Design a binder for this molecule. Structure first.
Ligand code: SIA
Length: 659
């Protein structure tokens, strides 16, 4: 199939270009595909890449366009005045604006298919949306089309939605092209910045909570939440996926599921984005959520994550029970057998399940990956799938048999419905991993575990103390080990208010560490310890970030090279009171007195573009890796979007801006 019109290198500054002669009545069937490779000179205002309209007086609601907003939303309109049919199809956060001070080339497309009555939009290799509409209009359905233009829409003799930039290449076809052809046509350099993609080797359509870490051997490692039933924190099914690079982040391994349950199949699901329907959740698979990575002195790598039993959400988890008993001074994970009210059982030595009323072993045991055996044989349960087809959610037993697990809703023995922390270890830098270990009840028997602060942990240089950041909702919990991670303890620091205090650490000088964290007051807080984390200062606040009350996670890392003759820290966060937007990377130089001079910053894209959770690492060549949620992950308008967690690289000279 060849285009009815192809144009190259059309630079426009809001005035558009008439192409009526070269497109008039060429859309025989009425269907269309338009593929546009462009870059914007300015993101301001509502801008049309092209417009097909009735330009006559009174016919201002008779047009088709593809549009861009200042927040990266890609959409299309198809409207007819006399039928009063107004179709708008879009998805937030579909395009990129600028990157390292330069306009980004995107390639987008629209397909209108009369037989299916669907409009489809594509950006940078991804089908960002396909929607069937009852009031479907093709070009022939709109009355009195007489004007076709690039970079605007002709409404009552005036150019509306003027485009500012260059249409590097634009192709108009008079048919609906197939999905695979259009994905291929829109694939470009931007496509290559995704490490995790929808329905890759994770099986997940969605992702959140990226983490980057550079190991001692030069390997750059990533982990992420693979979130299967939309991007909901809860209820959902979530696994932790991983992917790594041995060439300074240029190429990455196909992602693997590293922490995953199998009560639910890890399947690609088309989660609804409509008002109302977008609130839909599955009934909940067992879940791993919010990963934290650290490399030990001995090069062993640890990964932590929160563990959620099936159907248990952070909102519903009981705060008054750890899920453990103490018996003869040992902490044993406790179990309730189906049909009991009390928790009468414990997992003791060798995974043997004991009846605590009699202090005798039962027929039952639990292996290192939480699977239940009876007399040495695995009990099983049937896996669940989720499906739509293509309007109504169904959960059903799918014919696959998996091991019965103490975290599953169909288990004969179940854990307390609360949150836990698990960790795993690797001796080959993330190629293979141990079985999980649940953290003992460090908060006490009658409190739930803390919640991890996603990102990294650190090794404090003077003592060797390992620090893992977490929070409870009213306190900071700094989890630590003084024996190279053989045993874990905690410092609980009460906070001014009920902050979701996701934190990250930096070391200023030997023994002096600061914990930077999310608050509920709009500011980033930092607490200071001068005894390697044993005691902490009252909070102080950065003076240059102002965010909404809900706040967002941040990333801060130490940097190994001097900047302006000084030891440096590097911080990533959104900075906007309007939402999770206006991503910034800040360089802080450490003063002789261990205060920080926040001297430089660089804006990641335009200020109304989305920016939520993020993660920084120093690459082995001293460049900076960044992976981030390129959307607003709090907004109810930006839920359940595919392919929006990119990875980018900066030289320090790219970052040394604004002073
Ligand atoms: C993509 C989009 O939102 N288009 C809408 C526009 C713009 O909001 C404003 O023109 C601001 O540029 O406003 C309309 O009232 C209009 O012009 O008929 C409805 C239309 O659907």
């Amino acid at each position: 199939e060849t285009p009815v019109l192809e144009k190259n290198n059309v630079t426009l500054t809001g005035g558009g270009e008439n192409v009526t002669k070269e497109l008039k009545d060429k859309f025989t069937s009425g269907d269309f595909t338009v593929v546009i490779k462009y870059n914007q000179s300015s993101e301001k205002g509502l801008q049309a890449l092209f417009g097909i309209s009735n330009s006559k007086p009174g016919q201002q609601n008779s047009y088709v366009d593809v549009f861009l907003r200042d927040n990266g939303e890609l959409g299309m309109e198809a409207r007819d005045t006399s039928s009063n049919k107004n179709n708008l199809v879009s998805r937030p956060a579909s395009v990129w604006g600028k990157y390292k001070q330069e306009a980004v080339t995107n390639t987008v497309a629209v397909v209108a298919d009369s037989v299916k009555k669907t409009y489809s939009l594509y950006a940078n290799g991804t089908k960002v949306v396909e929607k069937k509409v009852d009031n479907f209009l093709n070009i022939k359905d709109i009355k009195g089309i007489d004007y076709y233009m690039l970079g605007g829409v002709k409404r009552a003799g005036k150019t509306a939605f003027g485009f500012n930039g260059t249409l590097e290449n634009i192709k108009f076809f008079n048919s609906a092209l197939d999905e695979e052809t259009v994905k291929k046509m829109t694939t470009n350099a931007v496509t290559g910045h995704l490490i995790y993609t929808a329905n890759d080797t994770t099986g997940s359509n969605y992702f959140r909570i990226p983490v980057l870490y550079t190991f001692s051997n030069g390997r750059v490692f990533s982990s992420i939440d693979a979130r299967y039933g939309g991007t909901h924190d809860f209820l959902n099914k979530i696994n932790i996926a991983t992917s790594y690079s041995d060439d300074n982040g240029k190429t990455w391994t196909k992602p693997k599921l590293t922490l995953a349950f199998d009560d639910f199949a890890p399947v690609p699901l088309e989660w609804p984005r409509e008002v109302g329907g977008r609130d839909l959740q599955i009934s909940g698979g067992a879940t791993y959520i919010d990963s934290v990575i650290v490399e030990k002195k001995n090069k062993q790598v640890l990964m932590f994550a929160d563990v959620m039993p099936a159907g248990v959400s952070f909102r519903e988890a009981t705060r008054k029970d750890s899920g453990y008993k103490q018996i003869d001074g040992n902490y044993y994970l406790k179990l309730r057998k189906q049909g009991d009210t009390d928790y009468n059982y414990t997992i003791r030595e060798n995974g043997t399940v004991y009846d605590d009323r009699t202090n005798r072993p039962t027929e039952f045991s639990v292996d290192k990956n939480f699977g239940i055996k009876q007399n040495g044989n695995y009990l099983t349960v049937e896996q669940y799938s989720v499906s739509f087809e293509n309007n109504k959610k169904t959960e059903y037993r799918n014919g696959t048999k998996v091991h019965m697990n103490i975290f599953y809703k169909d288990a004969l023995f179940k854990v307390v419905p609360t949150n836990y922390i698990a960790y795993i270890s690797s001796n080959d830098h993330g190629e293979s991993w141990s079985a999980p270990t649940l953290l003992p009840p460090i908060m006490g028997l009658n409190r739930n575990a803390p919640y991890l602060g996603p990102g990294r942990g650190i090794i404090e240089s003077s003592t060797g103390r390992i620090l893992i950041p977490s929070y409870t909702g009213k306190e900071s919990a700094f989890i630590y080990s003084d024996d190279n991670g053989a045993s874990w303890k905690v410092k609980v620091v009460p906070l001014p208010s009920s902050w979701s205090a996701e934190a990250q650490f930096v070391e200023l000088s030997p023994g002096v560490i600061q914990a930077y964290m999310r608050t509920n007051n709009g500011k980033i807080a930092y607490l200071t310890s001068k005894d390697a984390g044993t005691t902490w200062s009252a909070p102080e606040y950065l003076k240059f970030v102002s965010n909404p009350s809900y706040g967002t996670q941040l990333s801060i890392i130490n940097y190994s090279q001097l900047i302006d003759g000084k030891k440096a820290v590097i911080l990533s966060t959104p900075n906007s009171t309007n939402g999770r937007k206006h991503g910034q990377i800040w360089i802080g130089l450490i003063n002789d007195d261990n205060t920080i001079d926040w001297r430089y910053h660089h804006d990641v894209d335009y200020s109304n573009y989305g920016y939520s959770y993020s993660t920084l690492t120093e690459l082995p060549n001293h460049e900076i890796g960044l992976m981030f949620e390129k959307f607003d992950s709090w907004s109810r308008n930006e839920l359940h979007m595919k392919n929006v967690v990119p990875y980018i690289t900066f030289k320090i000279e790219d970052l040394k801006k604004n002073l």
